């Protein structure tokens, strides 16, 4: 049973300045939720009970977000917002959130190694926080279900258009079966010709304790290479992810994500669409002059 | 006789309208395009020629103070990466104005908050800027209030008209008349019922005030700031500027989305990608709908 998960969150989030000048990338609101909350929500509903966040300096707000906020709870009760005061309490209840500091930044490989003693001897989940997934079955849960079966290192995938492939990590299927591709090798951001498929891994993984040894020997320790050297000995699995994927690596990415998820809320759906119609009308008019 | 050189931004709000985003971080740091709302306000003030700002802050609002200082660990990462355009943009933020802080001890609204500023401005005219809208203007909104001050030298208020329904959301002027761009306030009521309201002209959290206002505010006292404009009106009548620019209220989650969109569309770097995306959303929503 996979019951533990690792979110690396040590990035200084430069792509988002000046929003992130003095506050973390992962706290940026997506609709009105911090990005990080979406990821912990994924994990909780996937049945993870314990999360380790590899954090850095001045990311106190993440730790605060998932605890009881006394001065807020008071202020909410003392104003009636009872539904809200309950929503806030639930956030602090999603999972047991552990923290470790990445000492200096040596990438998602060092980061995964930090988890070593915490997970110890289980299979664990890693969730980079690079995209938000809307699904009938939570994205990670789907990776776990392929794990429950094959019990090897499973990867989460979706297809992407050629001439996009240098942005992502790439499987190399010889076989494809059910909802589960079968991995023979792996490449980190290949040139469109170098690339042996149009399938990218979407910052979701389930891994084995084993992977720790593996990750240590290999060593700027890229995590993919350790999936590669596991593939030479033995072949892994990949799940095609049911659901909608919103990349949030960009300022624009985020705007899009805010909009699409916004459109899922009945209270904002119509207000939003109406507003977008009127922006376009206004932009056409101004343009024909 | 005196130039307005100082401004007061109250920022002690717990920002409930924005939960859960604001559970563990301040309302005023929420990004509008990619700038914290608070930065828009300091930018207004800076370009209006304000040199010194006092923020009345509260608990766990360190991020505001940090935002406007040098960020050593970031400067390193930027320098050691080439991004010198950025490292220069960040340095400018920390240069907009001289930013002072005071903690509001207990939460007793603007008014009390304005009183905190007393000793800091001492004996000048000062600006207050609540942070409830962004104004896009040829002339920065506050500058326009200051220009009416330069002449009439009374307590000037910043105004724009609003549709009848929304008058209970605002403070409403009560003119006798109007001359060029400057109304002539006779009284003021704080968010009245739509019939009780004696105009459709609302104050847009911009004020220029006199030291005098301190005394005034003390006697009155839950210290509403409007009532102190009222008791100034009993002795003598105030002035109001109609504001030139385009106004984006950010009091609401929706308000902010709209503000992000409009200001986004004004930035050449993002304008086309954005607009294309918006066209695309509607096209896709029509298709899905016809089936």
HEC string of chain A equals: CCCEEEEEECCCCHHHCCCCCCCCHHHCECCCCEHHHHHHHHHHHCCCCEEEEEECCCCHHHHHHCCCCHHHHHHHHCCCCHHHHHHHHHHCCCCEEEEEECCCCCHHHHHHHHCHHHHCCCCEEEECCCEEEECCCCHHHHHHHHHHHHCCCEEEEEECCCCCHHHCEEEEEEEEECCEEEEEEEEECCCCCCCCCCEEEEEEEEECCCHHHHHHHCCCCCCHHHHHHHHHHCCEEEEECCCEEEECCCHHHHHHHHHHHHCCCHHHHHHHHHHHHHHHHHHHHHHCC
Q: What angle do CA B4, B7, B12 make, to 5 degrees?
A: 165
CB burial string A244-280: b at 16+ within 10 A, e below = ebbbbeebebbbbbbbbbbbeeeebeebbbebbeebb
If you measure CA to CA, which chain B residue comes closest to A92? B23
Interface residue B279 vs chain A (CB under 8 A): yes
List the single residue in A21, A71, A251 with the smallest CB-CB distance to B59. Answer: A71
Interface residue B91 vs chain A (CB under 8 A): no
Q: What are phi and psi of B226, to 5 degrees?
A: -70, -40
Number of helices followed by number of strands (H, E) in chain B: 11, 11
Q: What Å resolution does this PDB entry report?
A: 2.8
Calpha distance A218→A215 (Å, rounded): 6
Q: Do A279 and B264 touch (CB under 8 A)?
A: no
**Element housing B282 (H / E):** helix B268-290
Give the three-state DSSP class for B213: helix
d(CA B262, nearest CA chain A) in Å: 8
Q: Do A273 and B282 touch (CB under 8 A)?
A: yes
CB burial string A171-203: b at 16+ within 10 A, e below = bbbeeeeeebbbbebbbeeeeeeebebbbbbbb
Interface residue A244 vs chain B (CB under 8 A): no
Is there a cis peptide before residue A18, judged by omega within 30 degrees of 0? yes
How far separated are the first and last CA of chain A, in Å rounded? 64
Q: Do A280 and B278 touch (CB under 8 A)?
A: yes
Q: Do A283 and B275 touch (CB under 8 A)?
A: yes
Interface residue B270 vs chain A (CB under 8 A): yes
List the single residue in A21, A88, A271 with the smallest CB-CB distance to B23. Answer: A88
**Closest residue by Cα to residue B199 from B223, B229, B224, B178:** B178
Q: Do A88 and B19 touch (CB under 8 A)?
A: yes
Interface residue A84 vs chain B (CB under 8 A): yes
Interface residue B94 vs chain A (CB under 8 A): no
Contacts of A19 (CB under 8 A, 6+ apart): A28, B31, B34, B35, B36
d(CA B49, nearest CA chain A) in Å: 23
Per-position DSSP letters for B107-165, written without gaps between them: --HHHHHHHHTHHHH-SS-EEEE--SEEEE-SS-HHHHHHHHHHHH-S-EEEEEE--GG
Q: Do A256 and B277 touch (CB under 8 A)?
A: yes
Interface of A with B in 28-47 (CB under 8 A): 28-29, 31-34, 37
């Amino acid at each position: 049973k996979v019951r533990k998960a690792v979110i690396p969150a040590a990035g200084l989030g430069t792509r988002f300045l000046p929003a992130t000048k003095a506050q973390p990338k992962e706290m940026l609101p997506i609709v009105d939720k911090p990005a990080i909350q979406y990821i912990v929500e994924e994990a909780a509903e996937s049945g993870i009970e314990d999360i380790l966040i590899i954090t850095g300096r001045n990311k106190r707000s993440i730790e605060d977000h998932f605890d009881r906020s006394a001065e807020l709870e008071f202020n909410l009760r003392e104003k009636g917002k009872t539904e809200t005061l309950k929503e806030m309490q639930q956030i602090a209840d999603l999972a047991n959130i552990h923290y470790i500091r990445q000492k200096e930044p040596l990438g998602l490989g060092h980061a995964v190694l930090c988890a070593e003693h915490f997970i110890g001897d289980e299979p664990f989940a890693v969730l980079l926080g690079d995209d938000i997934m809307v699904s009938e079955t939570p994205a990670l849960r789907q990776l776990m279900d392929v794990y429950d079966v094959y019990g090897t290192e499973v990867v989460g995938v979706q297809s992407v258009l050629p001439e996009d492939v240098s942005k992502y990590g790439i499987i190399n299927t010889s076989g494809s079966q059910g909802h589960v591709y079968e991995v023979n090798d792996l490449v980190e951001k290949p040139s469109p010709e170098e690339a042996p498929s149009e399938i990218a891994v979407m910052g979701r993984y389930v891994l084995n304790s084993s992977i720790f040894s593996v990750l240590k020997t290999i060593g700027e320790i890229q995590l993919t290479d350790a999936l590669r050297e596991v593939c030479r000995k033995e072949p892994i699995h990949a799940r095609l992810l049911e659901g909608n994927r919103y990349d949030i690596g960009d300022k624009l990415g985020c705007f899009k994500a805010s909009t699409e998820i916004g459109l899922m809320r009945p209270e904002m759906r119509s207000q939003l669409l109406a507003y977008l119609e009127d922006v376009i009308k206004r932009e056409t008019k101004e343009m024909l002059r």
